[PDB]
Design a protein around this nucleic acid. Structure first.
Ligand code: MG
Ligand code: MG
Ligand code: MG
Ligand code: MG
Ligand code: MG
Ligand code: MG
Ligand code: MG
Ligand code: MG
Ligand code: MG
Ligand code: MG
Ligand code: MG
Ligand code: MG
Ligand code: MG
Ligand code: MG
Ligand code: MG
Length: 154
RNA sequence: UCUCAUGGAGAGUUCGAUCCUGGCUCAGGAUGAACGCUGGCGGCAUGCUUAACACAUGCAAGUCGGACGGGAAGUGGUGUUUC
């Protein structure tokens, strides 16, 4: 999914040397997602490079039986800060462009999110990845703390 | 994987491009609203925000004859009853 297409410029003695930068995320909508960034002379080629760079950068988002987040989380990348919190089933995904495409492509069905701090697409994507990467699923906190699930449930 | 949550979306604009700090602007709701164009019906509401500025006319607080003396309508008369 192509998030953003921009025309960046290098300048040479001749004139303006034009390129396209594409920010693109890939997902299966099944709980596997990644971000990637690419650069080329043509829209198509940059799209493609972005595709590959993403595929080799990819990770997995912890999910809950209802297709949502384990818990509430913040994240920080550059000047982009990102706020995610779990939702009740049937609320859909409500968020802004970068965060929303990332989460939607991960396959998260119900999520609250707001990017605070900056607006830049790319950074917000990476921040979202940082968020959902640090998410701890309950089985694993049970295993870490060394305490049975039902005891933390209460 | 019980319980809680029914809730927080962005976009454009400084640069040859970038990231940022930063303002301006937009998308939403609400009117005791006004104006433009258009306008079939019903249900429930609402209707001088400004000049506590002037007011023509008509009506918005009276009743009690079982507190009381009279007089005035009739009636034949203080037997009747009204104002
Ligand atoms: Mg190279
Ligand atoms: Mg900071
Ligand atoms: Mg914001
Ligand atoms: Mg400047
Ligand atoms: Mg310019
Ligand atoms: Mg700011
Ligand atoms: Mg409006
Ligand atoms: Mg008319
Ligand atoms: Mg008034
Ligand atoms: Mg008068
Ligand atoms: Mg009257
Ligand atoms: Mg009487
Ligand atoms: Mg009387
Ligand atoms: Mg009496
Ligand atoms: Mg008498």
């Amino acid at each position: 999914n192509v998030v953003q297409v921009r025309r960046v410029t290098k300048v040479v003695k001749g004139g303006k040397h034009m390129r396209f930068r594409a920010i693109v995320v890939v997902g299966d909508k099944k709980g596997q997602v990644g971000v990637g960034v690419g650069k080329a002379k043509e829209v198509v080629s940059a799209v493609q490079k972005a595709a590959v760079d993403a595929r080799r950068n990819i990770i997995t988002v912890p999910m809950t039986k209802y297709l949502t987040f384990p818990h509430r989380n913040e994240a920080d990348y550059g000047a982009a800060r990102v706020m995610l919190r779990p939702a009740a089933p049937g609320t859909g995904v409500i968020a802004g462009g970068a965060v929303r495409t990332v989460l939607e492509m991960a396959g998260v069905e119900n999520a609250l999110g707001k990017q605070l701090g900056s607006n830049n697409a790319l950074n917000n994507a990476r921040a979202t990845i940082v968020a959902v990467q640090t998410m701890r699923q309950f089985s694993d906190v049970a295993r870490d703390r060394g305490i049975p699930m039902e005891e933390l449930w209460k």
